C-alpha cells in the first residue's frame, strides 16, 4: 500500500466485547497495524483509538456512512444483547437519544458492503451468550437475519482471533473486489467460507490432525502435568481434536508460542465455545 492509495472506509463497533479483538489486531506483524491504518483501510470510527468523541464521533460515522452508502465495511467486536430493549449495551448518544447496539446494527447493518464479525462473541455469541448469562447476547448473523437484514457476513472467530486471520480476511476480500467488483468479489469470498462462515484458508484445517504431539496421542502417551512437554495434552483437556484453526503452523505473538505447546487448546474458534469446550482441564 501507499499513504495516497485507495483505502475503503471501515467502522468498528463494539458491542459486548472485551477489546481483545482490537488488541489482537494491534499485534499484527506484517503488515504492521500502522501500515494497515495508513495504507490499507480508512478506520473512520473506532471507540478505542479515534481522536474525536461522543456525539461528534457518532455524527462523523453517520456522515461517512451517507457518503459511502453500500460501500463501507462494518466490523463488529462483541455480541449484541437483545434483552431489556437493548439496554445491556449502549454505545453512544446523539440528539439527546441513546443508541443501543441493537439500534446501531439496525442502522448501519443494512448499508454496509459487508459485516465482518470479528471474534467468537460477534461470530457465535461466545462467553456473553454462555450458560448463566441473561442479556440475550446474540451473534451478528442471527441478529441480522432475525431483523431481515441481508448484508453479507463473514465470521473471523477466535477468542481472540489471531491478527493474521483478521488482516488476512480483509486482504482476501479486497483482492476479490479488485478483481471482480464489490458484488462479484463478495461472491468469491462467500465461496471460501465453511458452514460456520469462516474463511477456509485459516480455518480449513484441524489442529489435532496437524499437531506435533499426534504421535504421542496415537501411542497413548499423555502428560500428567502441564509442564511435561513430551506427552500429548489430551488428558489435560486439549480440544485440538474438535478445533479448526491453523495455530499449529502460524503460532501466536510473532511465532513465540501457541496454546498446545504452552498448555492446552480450549477450542476458542468453535461455535460452541465456551460451553461445548468446557470443562477446559479434563477430557
Amino acid at each position: 500500500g501507499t499513504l495516497t492509495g485507495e483505502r475503503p472506509p471501515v467502522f468498528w463497533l463494539q458491542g459486548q466485547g472485551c477489546t481483545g479483538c482490537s488488541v489482537t489486531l494491534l499485534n499484527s506483524v506484517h503488515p504492521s497495524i500502522a501500515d494497515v491504518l495508513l495504507k490499507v483501510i480508512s478506520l473512520e470510527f473506532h471507540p478505542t483509538v479515534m481522536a474525536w468523541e461522543g456525539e461528534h464521533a457518532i455524527e462523523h460515522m453517520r456522515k461517512v456512512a451517507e457518503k459511502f452508502k453500500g460501500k463501507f465495511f462494518l466490523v463488529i467486536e462483541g455480541s449484541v444483547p437483545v434483552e431489556a430493549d437493548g439496554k445491556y449495551c449502549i454505545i453512544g448518544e446523539a440528539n439527546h437519544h441513546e443508541i443501543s447496539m441493537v439500534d446501531a446494527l439496525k442502522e448501519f447493518g443494512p448499508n454496509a458492503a459487508a459485516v465482518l464479525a470479528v471474534g467468537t462473541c460477534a461470530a457465535y455469541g461466545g462467553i456473553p451468550a454462555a450458560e448463566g448469562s441473561e442479556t440475550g447476547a446474540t451473534a451478528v448473523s442471527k441478529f441480522l437475519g432475525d431483523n431481515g437484514i441481508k448484508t453479507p457476513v463473514v465470521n473471523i472467530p477466535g477468542c481472540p482471533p489471531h491478527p493474521d486471520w483478521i488482516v488476512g480476511t480483509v486482504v482476501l476480500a479486497l483482492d476479490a473486489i479488485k478483481k471482480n467488483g464489490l458484488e462479484g468479489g463478495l461472491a468469491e469470498v462467500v465461496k471460501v467460507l465453511d458452514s460456520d462462515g469462516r474463511p477456509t484458508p485459516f480455518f480449513g484445517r484441524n489442529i489435532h490432525e496437524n499437531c506435533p504431539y499426534l504421535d504421542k496421542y496415537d501411542e497413548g502417551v499423555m502428560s500428567a502435568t502441564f509442564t511435561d512437554k513430551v506427552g500429548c495434552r489430551y488428558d489435560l483437556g486439549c480440544k485440538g481434536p474438535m478445533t479448526m484453526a491453523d495455530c499449529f503452523e502460524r503460532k501466536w505473538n510473532g511465532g513465540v508460542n501457541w496454546c498446545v505447546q504452552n498448555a492446552v487448546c480450549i477450542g476458542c474458534v468453535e461455535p460452541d465455545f465456551p460451553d461445548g469446550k468446557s470443562p477446559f482441564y479434563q477430557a
Binding site: 491504518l37 473506532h46 483509538v49 479515534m50 449502549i90 454505545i91 505473538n253
Partner: protein
C-alpha cells in the same frame, strides 16, 4: 456565565463503554455522573462451572488487562484448592504479568492518551476532532509525539511477545492455572525474553518517561486540577517470596491526608445508583450478589459503587506510587529540576496536590513503568531455567478463596466459593470499578466523578478537558462492569 450540561457518549480512547455527563457553571465543572453502559454478567456466567475454568473465562472480562484477571483468579483458586505454587512458578507468573504492565501503560499513554496533547496525521482515525483541541506542542515536539506513537505500536507488540513466551498467547493467556504456571522457562526462551525486554527498557527510559515530563511541562496547568478526594487504595501485588506477606507493591489506604492499613472486610458494594436489585446493596464481596435491574429508577450505571469503610477511593499507578512512595527515576528527578524547578527524590516529594492531578496521574504511570523494569530485571536473575513451575491439585468439594493483585489500572480481587465441586459464587471487585463508579447509597460520588469537579471548560463548544481528566485514570469499563 451560567450553566451548560454536556453529555459525552461514547467517551473514546478508553477501554469500553462510558458516558460522562457534566454540569458546567461559569467555566468549571460543578457536577458529574459516569455511566458504564454495557453489561455481560461474568459473576453469573461462572456459576456451576468447574472452578478451574474460571482462570480462562474471567480473562474475557478484558482483552487489555487479561493477565490481571488471570492472576487474581489463579490466586483465588490456589487458596481455595490449597495449591502450593512452586517458587519457580511464582516467578514465572510475575514475568508473564509484569510484561503486560509494560504493554498496558505504553498503550495507555501513547495510543489512548497522547492524542489529547498531540495532533496526528490528517487522516482517520486521527481526524476529524475538536476544532479548538488545545494542542500546544511545537511542530518538533508534536512530531516527536507522533514518531513515538508509531514506535510504541511496535514496542507494545513486543511486550505481548514477552507475555506469550511463557503465557502461550496474548490476549488471553493459557499459561497461568491453579497450582502455578504451565510452562517451565527454558534457558533459550529466557534469552528471547531478555532480548525483547532490553528493547522495551530502552524505549521506556529514552522515549516514554522523558516525553511525559516534557509534554507535562507544556501543560503545567494540568497539575492544578483533577484532585478529587485525594484518596487512594492499594491491595498489594507481585509476591516477592512464598510467604504471602511481601509484595512489590505493598497494601495501604490513603484518605483525608492520612495513611491507614488495608482491611478487605471493610469493602462494601452499593447499588442505589447502579442497575442492580435494591436488596443487593451494601454487600461485602464474600457475600456479593449480581442481580441486574436495567429498568430501576434513578440508577445510571452497570458499575457497582465500592466503598472502603464508607470512603470513595481511587486506584492505579498514582495510588500505588503514593501509597508505596518509591524513589523517582533518575530521568524524572532530572526533568523535574530542569523543566519544573522541582527538587524531588521520592514520589511524595511532588506533593499531594500535584500528584493527585490530571497530569500527575500520567507522570505516576510513566514512573511506575520505569519501576517495573527493575522488578522484571530482578525476576530474570531469580528465575531458574528448567525448574518445575506447577502442581496439579485435586478440585475440592467445598472451599473458598480470594486473590488480591494490582491490575495496571488498580486494585483487583476475585473471590470464589466452591460447593459440590462447582462454582457456587464468584465475585469480582476490579480497578476501574473503584475509579469509574457512580454515587453510593448516601450520594457520595465515585473517584473520577469527584475528580471532574473543578475541571476547566472555558469553551463549551470544545470541552476537551472533561475527557482529558477521565483518560488520565486509564478507564476500562469492561473491567468495571464485568
Amino acid at each position: 456565565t451560567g450553566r451548560t450540561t454536556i453529555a459525552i457518549d461514547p467517551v473514546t480512547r478508553i477501554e469500553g463503554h462510558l458516558k460522562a455527563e457534566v454540569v458546567v457553571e461559569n467555566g468549571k465543572v460543578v457536577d458529574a455522573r459516569l455511566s458504564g453502559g454495557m453489561y455481560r454478567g461474568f459473576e453469573t456466567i461462572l456459576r456451576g462451572r468447574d472452578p478451574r475454568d474460571a482462570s480462562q473465562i474471567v480473562q474475557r472480562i478484558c482483552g487489555v488487562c487479561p493477565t490481571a484477571h488471570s492472576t487474581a483468579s489463579v490466586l483465588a483458586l490456589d487458596e481455595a484448592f490449597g495449591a502450593k505454587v512452586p517458587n519457580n512458578g511464582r516467578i514465572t507468573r510475575n514475568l508473564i504479568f509484569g510484561a503486560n504492565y509494560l504493554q498496558s501503560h505504553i498503550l495507555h499513554f501513547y495510543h489512548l492518551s497522547a492524542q489529547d496533547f498531540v495532533q496526528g496525521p490528517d487522516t482517520a482515525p486521527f481526524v476529524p476532532r475538536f476544532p479548538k483541541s488545545d494542542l500546544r506542542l511545537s511542530k518538533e515536539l508534536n512530531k516527536a509525539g507522533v514518531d513515538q506513537y508509531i514506535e510504541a505500536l511496535e514496542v507494545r507488540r513486543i511486550c505481548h511477545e514477552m507475555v506469550a513466551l511463557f503465557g502461550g498467547r496474548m490476549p488471553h493467556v493459557q499459561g497461568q492455572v491453579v497450582g502455578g504456571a504451565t510452562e517451565i522457562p527454558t534457558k533459550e526462551k529466557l534469552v528471547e525474553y531478555a532480548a525483547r525486554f532490553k528493547k522495551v527498557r530502552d524505549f521506556v527510559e529514552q522515549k516514554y518517561v522523558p516525553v511525559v515530563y516534557t509534554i507535562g511541562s507544556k501543560y503545567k496547568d494540568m497539575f492544578k486540577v483533577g484532585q478529587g478526594f485525594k484518596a487512594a487504595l492499594c491491595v498489594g501485588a507481585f509476591p516477592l517470596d512464598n510467604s504471602g506477606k511481601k509484595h512489590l507493591f505493598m497494601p495501604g489506604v490513603y484518605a483525608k491526608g492520612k495513611d491507614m492499613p488495608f482491611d478487605p472486610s471493610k469493602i462494601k458494594e452499593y447499588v442505589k445508583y447502579s442497575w442492580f436489585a435494591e436488596e443487593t446493596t451494601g454487600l461485602n464481596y464474600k457475600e456479593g450478589k449480581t442481580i441486574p435491574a436495567p429498568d430501576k429508577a434513578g440508577a445510571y450505571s452497570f458499575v457497582k459503587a465500592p466503598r472502603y469503610d464508607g470512603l470513595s477511593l481511587e486506584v492505579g499507578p498514582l495510588a500505588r506510587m503514593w501509597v508505596n512512595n518509591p524513589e523517582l527515576s533518575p530521568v524524572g528527578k532530572k526533568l523535574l529540576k530542569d523543566l519544573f524547578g522541582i527538587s524531588a527524590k521520592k514520589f511524595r516529594d511532588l506533593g499531594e496536590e500535584a500528584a493527585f492531578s490530571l497530569m500527575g496521574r500520567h507522570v505516576a504511570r510513566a514512573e511506575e513503568t520505569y519501576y517495573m523494569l527493575g522488578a522484571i530485571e530482578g525476576w530474570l536473575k531469580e528465575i531458574k531455567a528448567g525448574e518445575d513451575t506447577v502442581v496439579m491439585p485435586a478440585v475440592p468439594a467445598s472451599a473458598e478463596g480470594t486473590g488480591f493483585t494490582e491490575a495496571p489500572r488498580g486494585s483487583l480481587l476475585h473471590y470464589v466459593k466452591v460447593k459440590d465441586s462447582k462454582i457456587d459464587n464468584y465475585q469480582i471487585v476490579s480497578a476501574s470499578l473503584w475509579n469509574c463508579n457512580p454515587r453510593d447509597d448516601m450520594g457520595q460520588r465515585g473517584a473520577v466523578e469527584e475528580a471532574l469537579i473543578g475541571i476547566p471548560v472555558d469553551d463549551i463548544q470544545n470541552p476537551v478537558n472533561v475527557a482529558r481528566l477521565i483518560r488520565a485514570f486509564d478507564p476500562x469499563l469492561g473491567c468495571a462492569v464485568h
